[PDB]
């Protein structure tokens, strides 16, 4: 028959845990570290890239920080391809909400929807989950600055600062150490960088190994600006902080 070759990707262990989910999380823990830090006037997303070389073109590259819509972005930890699938659909659900209501989509709604797509692979269909976890950085008229996270089990939660990927416990501990409710963007960047610096499985944190992003609501304007840092700018922000 055919049942013979079926892995049953959506079953429960005797312990009430979901194998494929637990095993996907594990996959994710070997992925480059991504961090999100929420300030009082912004949000920083920073990520450490995995798979590097002298020859890899960092200029025209974006393997961890993606723009979902003009007010929301995500940082990825996991399979980059599985990521793109979820991203392309999240981007779409954003535009649908817009067309339907003529208002940008509330960060949490977008998030919850994405988390719901993941929970599906958890309960039916018989397919492997996506080995991806997200840190969403977004702004909205109802809650302002928000930072959430979602993983293979389809569960999501909100955060003041958070990280996903490799060395979460380390980074988390460092973040719980130096983070304080009344921080500021230029400071969170520093923190973000510091944290990466001490969890990196490499020698030194170089520009080519980083991706940085900020969501600032500049005072002289009104529109929430999304700036995905360019290589030269990572190098700069890095020197300022002193990592050099």
């Amino acid at each position: 028959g055919s049942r013979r070759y079926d892995s049953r990707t959506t079953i429960f262990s005797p312990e009430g845990r979901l194998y494929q989910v637990e095993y996907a999380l594990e996959s994710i823990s070997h992925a480059g570290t991504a961090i999100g830090i929420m300030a009082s006037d912004g949000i920083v997303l920073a990520a450490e890239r995995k798979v590097t070389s002298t020859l890899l073109e960092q200029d025209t590259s974006t393997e961890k920080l993606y723009k979902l819509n003009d007010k929301i972005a995500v940082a990825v930890a996991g399979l980059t391809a599985d990521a793109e699938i979820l991203i392309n659909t999240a981007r779409i659900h954003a535009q649908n909400y817009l067309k339907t209501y003529n208002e940008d989509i509330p960060v949490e709604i977008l998030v919850r929807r994405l988390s719901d797509i993941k929970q599906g692979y958890t309960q039916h269909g018989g397919l492997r989950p996506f080995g991806v976890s997200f840190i969403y950085a977004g702004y909205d008229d109802r809650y302002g600055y928000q930072l959430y996270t979602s993983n293979p089990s389809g569960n999501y939660t909100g955060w003041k600062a958070i990280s996903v990927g490799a060395n979460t416990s380390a980074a988390q501990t460092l973040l719980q150490m130096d983070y304080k409710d009344d921080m500021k963007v230029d400071d969170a960047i520093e923190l973000a960088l510091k944290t990466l610096s001490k969890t990196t499985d490499s020698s030194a944190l170089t520009y080519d190994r980083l991706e940085f992003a900020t969501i600032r609501k500049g005072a002289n304007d009104g529109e929430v600006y999304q700036k995905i840092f360019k290589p030269q700018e990572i190098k700069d922000i890095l020197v300022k902080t002193g990592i050099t």
Binding site: S7, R8, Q20, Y23, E26, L79, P129
Partner: peptide, 17 residues
Amino acid sequence: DRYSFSLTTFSPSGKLG
């Protein structure tokens, strides 16, 4: 084609064999 399940799943080490 009754093979409607994934043939690439996650191993306990998080690898996709």
